[model samples]
Target: ANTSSAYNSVYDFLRYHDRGDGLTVNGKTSYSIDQAAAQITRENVSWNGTNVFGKSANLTFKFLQSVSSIPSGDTGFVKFNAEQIEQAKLSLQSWSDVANLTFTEVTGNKSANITFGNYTRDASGNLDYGTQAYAYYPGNYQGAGSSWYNYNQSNIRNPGSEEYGRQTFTHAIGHALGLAHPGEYNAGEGDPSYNDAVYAEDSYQFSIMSYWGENETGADYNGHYGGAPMIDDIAAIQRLYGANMTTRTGDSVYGFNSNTDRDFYTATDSSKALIFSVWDAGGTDTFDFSGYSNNQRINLNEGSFSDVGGLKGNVSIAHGVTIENAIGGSGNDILVGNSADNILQGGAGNDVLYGGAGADTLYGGAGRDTFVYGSGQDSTVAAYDWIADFQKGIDKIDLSAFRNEGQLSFVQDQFTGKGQEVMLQWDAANSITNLWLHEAGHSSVDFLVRIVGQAAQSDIIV
Candidate 1:
């Protein structure tokens, strides 16, 4: 079969080139196209210098030894307890969920294709950075070379926090699976400084494969810490293996706790809808159905949902239910929400969003999206909503439902003069603009809506 667009997209994103590192073509930066092609062609039996790439898509792993009984900092190194071990597994499983990959833990290191432990050296016995871990890519070798693994002891272990531990291992395993630091692709390419325009343009830090960690002061809005595989990472892995198969069907109750990749469906009876309950567990999950039909209704109640796949469906989110991340399909989907903070993304469709009650964040991804407000008199004061990516002319806000509740007026430059209620303001210092909502009789500010991106008054539809 020819290389699909999906495969080429991932290949170009990685930017694999000849970098003189015999092990890798991209100067120890990333894999070369030849190397990446070899994995999919089944010519490469090993993953990062090991035979982890067996005939099947499944990969087996085992713990070299039981985790330390004590907690981190006691032994001058982070200790791994049962909870930490599970978190590590969850991190590794994030990749397996998205691709035609399966990970099974086995007993005894001898039978394990990959082993997890705490150490600070590569196979060559070179001293690595105290806060680092490494993995060998698949090429040629026997048991030792074929056995891909990770050693995170010294300064790189944080067993106490689930996010820290999971992200650390997930990054290392990404290397073990033939992925490289995304930042390396553009670092010092066009500019002499290490921080080049390419890095900023690529937004590489948004991916787990990038070394750019989270921002502490919130200077950059796009900066993110690695925990779950980002969308680009998912596409890259799927190119190597195949995409995950969907098994969800009918009106079913599904719980998302660990890292997972599955499609959901509604029952044959159109009246019933598919329900999802996200547990307060770690690891991000992805629900993709870009190939399915239209008119699917997915209901999410409680907890955080990482990503919603493509489908022309109406999504209903209950109060207190948090959608950490989401994406709509190609149909005119309606995304209904409750009084809980959420991040809703409507991708490639003329979608509708009703951020019913909470201080929520919304992104109208790629199409003309409509933001609908409620009609009740109390609705305006209930919660604040943030429009993160509002494009002028392409998106519109629908206040028709709330039109009867009050006499609506657009307050331009409300931040310049201090009236008791500043309905709208532009913060040039932080590059943030807000539109506050209020009723005629209200004294203080009722609700504030922050607009992050570039937008204009013409974008709002009364």
Candidate 2:
């Protein structure tokens, strides 16, 4: 009947658009208004891209080559091409237009600005979305509609002959860039939010962001799907670039290592900028350049720093080093910086970090890690700052060694409008127990610690 005729007409349009040269490529035509309206709403951008990179500026990329070919009968490739077009446009057209918005491409990481992956394959060569979907949806739903795909890898792949790899990367990039799905389609012309629909199931319901097959005869292939980058995308990009306009003060070049610290440094500045370059020379060691100031430049041209498990060398600083973003590197290594604002990133493996003084930030990216907030009030303040900004991992303080067991406490307040200054106290054994300086202004501790069972403590002091 009408549905069947509609399907035939839609297929014919798609075929025309696919092979045709005019508005319709190949032989495919734009899908019906109803279909276009439905898909358009599902591809909306979710977050504000403004100030995404904050003050510190550096782009990073991680690579993964898991799946090679498209799924058996899925149309993942079609959407993949569309995604590629969008990404290319983003980096090529919009990226530079945003100013100070450095672009980093990381493979295998869904949090990266640009992620590239085939499907994840099983031992027998079958594709496995279960284990791979974590690349996009991480942790429990954090509300704000920011967290969508929770741990369902099965939902990662498209049902029809659509290529999820091609489309998923695009969508993930959108998310990383602070965008969300536009829900579904709408038909009432003019009104942006009017004819909206959401593709809750089947994952890719022919939206521009879908990893499913496209309806050639529908708006799915056109730019009309859902809320296609309407105003949110624009606002986000503006915020991102505007964030880069602020100036930075102080030096945190040399400091302990922690990812959250790095993020804080970068998130709080504008004038200062950091550059990160991966040197796969002769070994495998990552270096931190967060402390490069006074026009000091780090060169990775030396062949020694290219091995699989070798030292990536030291990050020397002149004048002082200030880091705006988390410095990430490969393998187990040291992130050394001079007196400057810093964000030291221990990219992978067990690593050691030395914050030479100054207000600094750090992150033990992955693996077991140790953080040392150098040697005085400046040192202690920096240490507290480190404790203040740290996001993940556990703390090990020998509380029994403190002079006044329980008396040694931390008091956070009037000093930094942000929060408290964590203090360490002496307990029974040779241990120095640490407690949060929960005072008025310092209540919302910036640092977080996860000690096995107990819920992750946040904005901790001392």
Candidate 3:
């Protein structure tokens, strides 16, 4: 569709030979016009699109025994020393660790998926002083004729330090993996204006795929560069190669149906009384710990999922899960409970917690949190659910489920430390110091919620 107008702009720029090499998509320099045109036609390329290597997730590359020598005093095109090679490996390791991509080093084969060499320039003297290194995007490569490295570039040779060398290579490899500069598409082809609309919202470009020459103080390229792939980079690569799956071991009985399946874990493991940790990858995912013993704890880490009400988000829990404890990750999550006593923690982001059918303890860590209650079979019963650290004007208790069922009433008073009741008291500071809502009379209270900390009467949305 050429929605961003990058295709026509890039094609015109390439036809005019305004740039030296082939079309420079993002910061990656393409050497062949045909390859560049194909990329444009496929629309698989992007300043950020899913133009990843389609051939395979696993990639292999080899180092050339001989490479172009650097001119005397040029220092820019130096050979790869022991430290530099190790740094290069570390660079590749960073991407493979986070995405489904993998890299392998091969010996004796000059013709590999990618070939690395130290070259100031070809015999034609095409690569000039400013040229660091160039690589072909996925599918643009003609067998072993695609990628290369030049040690003569100041950033490649001196690189200042070993970490710097790794950072440079990481940027180049990002090109190889089919990512464009962070804000290049919006800025169009040419020198970065750095005044693009995207930058107006976020002044910093903290992506390894971004031009290191710009925003040098950004976290991705500041002093050290071996930090894990930045958030944007992770999101980009994961979109191509699928999200990274991380597992944590705790004492309990829980496992997934399959590595790729979105099905939940309910079947008990022989090892009982063990707390199980389940971390999800990207995409709408779900974890069903409903079948596990209530004695064990289930920790649900970040990713995506289907909530008890069949709603999808980064993370979601089932309606019929009776576990001792459940902790959420940083993503916007939904945590539901069962008839047994439970503890739910909404770690970060705007989260939804439903203590369904249990005397549960709910904690909304940060962001504007929501507490859900209802009359559905899977909804929270008239049990006491303690809300820890509820912030007035920041969090809300959702009674839509109850309101949807029938007429509802509200009452706020002092907590006499008695039976089922709804109470709200102002402390000496004149703030809502403590509040409690318990299941009592038919027109009185249908659900119990004990809230500590400060909150407003308006925070409860009936």
Candidate 4:
């Protein structure tokens, strides 16, 4: 029984059943100390006993002292007793014979800050919807169990009252053991309805964790049962004590794929095909791109390189290199590739070099540099057929000089409305394919053709 020094008249009335030397009071019942303890334990408590070694589970709880004011100095004994009761009740039943629990009396612990006036009370003194009786935070993965509780006067009944002391410590202890407020489980499936049972029933009336006391007039006169322990709390203690974990499976720890790539990897192929690879200007140099493939045989190998000037590096590609973005270096660079299929872009400063006995694709990047594309200057055939593949806005592809061998359609105005559609037709029906729409201006832009009707899947080649 709680001392009157820590409880008030209301709470005292509730704990009257636990009072000894029964002199039958008008509205009170008496039970022996052991009877009360056994009754409380049977009606309200559960335990976790699994011993997971090297890992520990901690239930940090706050023990509310007097509600009058803050503990001016330090009430070490009050905190000590509160923590002791909390630890004891949490590990009440253990799978492991030896249970490990420790309590720390933290100063200014604010877990129990739910003041009486914070909740909404109905005409019948019942908390209405959206009413928060207690404050609890979601659980997190911290390698081990860690939880905090608040024990202020507001959390407990008035001080110097036995009922206040009994229920405050006991109920807080239940919370530390992973017990939620009664009537909170699955919408009070088995528990008596708090509203209707207030004046009708005796058992399953009050909540094990409610602020209200049992036997209060116009309220539930008895307590209700709680659900199974919280799974997370159970697993926490189990892992800490090394118990029953043979079926555990390993999970992902770390990897280097970006968010888009990671999502693609986890999603279906259809979803994966919806993604596009975006490369910046300087990102085109020596692109190997082998890891993105599902196969191992046709993997793209990194270009073999030779060190130059202790800084510059030379890479050799027998097949023509399709330059996507600009490339940079320290000095005037010489780019040599097979045939005239290689694309060379000199970026930033002025540079000079031969296409190397080939009709190379060359663009003077940034600075004023010499441009070499057609015949003479080494009679290399300028086979610039792949210019259409280059992305927009890059200076590497010169669209003005390049002729469109395919059907060319011009639209005077393009609609900017949402869900706008367009149609293009060629003079002759000979495939009616390979359509190119070029908009010429201060800054030119092009839209390659892709059919939307019966020819949707048809290839467009000039």
Candidate 5:
């Protein structure tokens, strides 16, 4: 009867990503929770029970020193540089934030569970840079838990960037931690296409283990890949290891004044792409994509994608995390909220704000923005939403979604005892304008949206 939660979004996303997985959420062949869990969990691979840390592993990793003797595809070995190691740790921290796993780097003959190194040659032992980068999955093999990159690939050398290098680290570590590709193809499979996918979610929009790009699944990340575990990846990995509930459990802010410290979540300007799925456990968190001048869409619903910093569908919320607030940028943006008590700010351009179902605070900053209401219950006297700024003629309040109720007529001052009437009352002393609406077939007023500033009859769109 009801569906709204951080947990609710998990199956919701899995359902959207389950187009090819035969995970039926509707009609007759629907999967139960246990059945769905059994389908997605990668039980064959894991770092626990055999390695150094034992059960429920706190895994240790190390970067291989520059040595030419070791042979991992007949390639020359090189140490990951300082910047590369930093980006690699950020990738590990992104994985650590969602699953019950920890990766601490070690030095010396540390016998690490996971190892990182760069290689010079391709698999064919030629001086090839294109056909490179590989990782052995978690298994009883010699090179298990080892990830090698082709050092000649320029993107591989630029590790801390938003391109494929940082994502390669996260994706390879996923393989090292008992995760497999969502599809069946391997690294030596002659460049598998989306036609090779076993399911439709085997793309970058859903998992880092995916070989295909996000555009394969109708998402355009604008040449940027997520450097973190995605929606399906989070759910699958959480099924393998228990969920990590200790991450960002406080009031954390992402984008702009981002406290996450992870580079993918923080953006200093529009030059960088904010590509990562959020995995916050508990928090009054905010998606503050306000520093850019792009026409962004910031959605606070878990597992939903947000097009931020001029990139299409680049940012997303993970399956089990709930973000409570969103701040849009200077361009004409769209801000959508969840059922939580949200704070949606449309900063400086002609923006559209939908405070979905909670007691939201909407601010239409400096432009002809619209505060949308689909129903009367969105804002009421009990939980009336506050519009912090409402210009008299420039900005607007949208109630066209209630056209089935009736065509609303503007009444001066009072509700004239008629239904489908709207009125704006200004408290001159407090500088507050209360938008009152009386739905059809109702005698008294049923909705009230409190506005901080002024709003005339022309400011409302019925």
Candidate 6:
């Protein structure tokens, strides 16, 4: 996946935020933040010391028992409520999943590495409703690892359901993990905003540590913030602590019916707004956006963005990851598969499926659909794809992409061992159909698609 076209885009993105911080994926090394800061002048400095970065650590997080737990002048601080602590754990688990470090819960003066608390006063000693949350970077100094949220904010106190609260927790914890804001400026530093970003990619779409919104990077999460380490953050964190190769290394499903319990990856219904970049390690995986009726452009390519559930760039496959399947909904969806064997389901819409280069299993559940192939290798004889459901007059298998390979001829029964031939072989006993194709210079015909239902020449578009 690191060699994929979509994966290459991540490298391009990395250049903006200090290349992958010395993390090497598929032999392509990326710079860690420390090294990146040294190279990219615009990037912020990184956390140092073995206690924070460049090592695998068994860390612990605890809810501060009192305002005294934090440093002086960090006023209006209070212990995290039950809900906040629970939500904070989820945020910690999200980070722990992608990096080599492990986070555990500690209570009662256990001296947790990360501390969670809430704040309500500004520097003037007044109740603060303007500021959301802030956290200190990793250090050995007292209260240096503490995070403070504006508990006065409803989104902060009520993190159990509100996405912003969860996002605040994740972002603050990012700081505790030795990550810095993508830019040199902060929220109140000379009243900085998105315009103050050092690079165009310095936004929530690329890094949760960013102060800017996703729109700054041409993405719209619909006010929902991703509560996990984003693309740049993943690369940055992995550069520091090393990539977590064991997380979700088995067959997993994201979006609907997600086996991953993380909120960012699971969307129980259409109303759930999903916003996160996937960090799967191995085995087959699927992006199941089948619960939404919105037209989606779901791509299984690694590090690619997908427009899902009516949100642009809401979903993404992280760099070095490989997702094998994608399920779409009923609004003229487009599902694309990777080079791996995929199971792409276009559920109940006039859908278009591209089994790019794999022995894919495609299902246009209903309505008029099209199966597109760009090259002969997309469905080679060695591993032909299966079009599980095909309606002869209603659906079409498009070979238009091969028009440059010379016009394909419709030779129904058998090929004369000639050039660019296509034929449909019907199995009456089993009620199956095998679509065979002979390329212009090939010695013999090969399997193109295996249809569960009967298909005729009218169902194909040459």
Each candidate's TM vs. the true structure?
Answer: 0.41, 0.23, 0.44, 0.20, 0.85, 0.86
lDDT of 5 by residue, 360-419 (tens): 999989888888877787887778899998888898888776666667888997777768
Q: Which digits, one per residue and each the tens of the lDDT, describe model 6 over residues 1-462?
A: 113222233233323223353444323344433343322222222334643445667787888787553463647777789999889988888888988888878887688788888877865688878878888777778877788888889999998878889988998888887778877776656888776655555678777888888886567888777888777778777767778999998999999999998888999888998888899999988889999999887877776677889987778776788999889988888787878899999999888888878799999889998887777888988899999988889988887755676777899687888678888898999988988888887776655788899887988878
Q: TM-score for candidate 5, please give it.
A: 0.85
User: Number of clashing pairs, model 3?
Assistant: 14
Clashing residue pair totals per candidate (backbone < 3 A): 10, 128, 14, 23, 0, 6
Against the hidden true structure, what lDDT does model 5 obtain?
A: 0.76
Over all chains combined, what TM-score does candidate 2 have? 0.23
Task: Return the lDDT, model 5, position 337.
Answer: 81
Model 1 lDDT per residue over 36-134, tens place? 323223323334333343222667776556433211111222224465567668767666655566788887434555555554444355554444444
Error of 1 at 77 (Å): 12
Identify the candidate with maximal TM-score: 6
Off by more than 4 A, model 3: 1-56, 68-78, 120-132, 140-164, 182-190, 196-206, 212-228, 244-421, 424-435, 438-462
Question: Which whole-number lDDT from 0 to 100 does residue 356 have in model 2?
Answer: 43
Per-residue lDDT of 352-376 in model 2, one digit per residue for the tens? 4544446555565565544543222
TM-score: model 4 vs. ground truth = 0.20
Candidate whose lDDT is highest: 6
The C-alpha local distance difference test score for the whole of candidate 6 amounts to: 0.77
Residue-by-residue lDDT tens digits, candidate 4, 261-290: 222112232112111111111122332211
Alpha-carbon local distance difference test for all models: 0.45, 0.32, 0.46, 0.27, 0.76, 0.77
Question: Which residue ranges in model 1 land beyond 4 Å of their true spot?
Answer: 1-56, 66-83, 120-129, 140-156, 160-162, 183-205, 214-226, 247-462
lDDT comparison, 2 vs 5, better candidate? 5
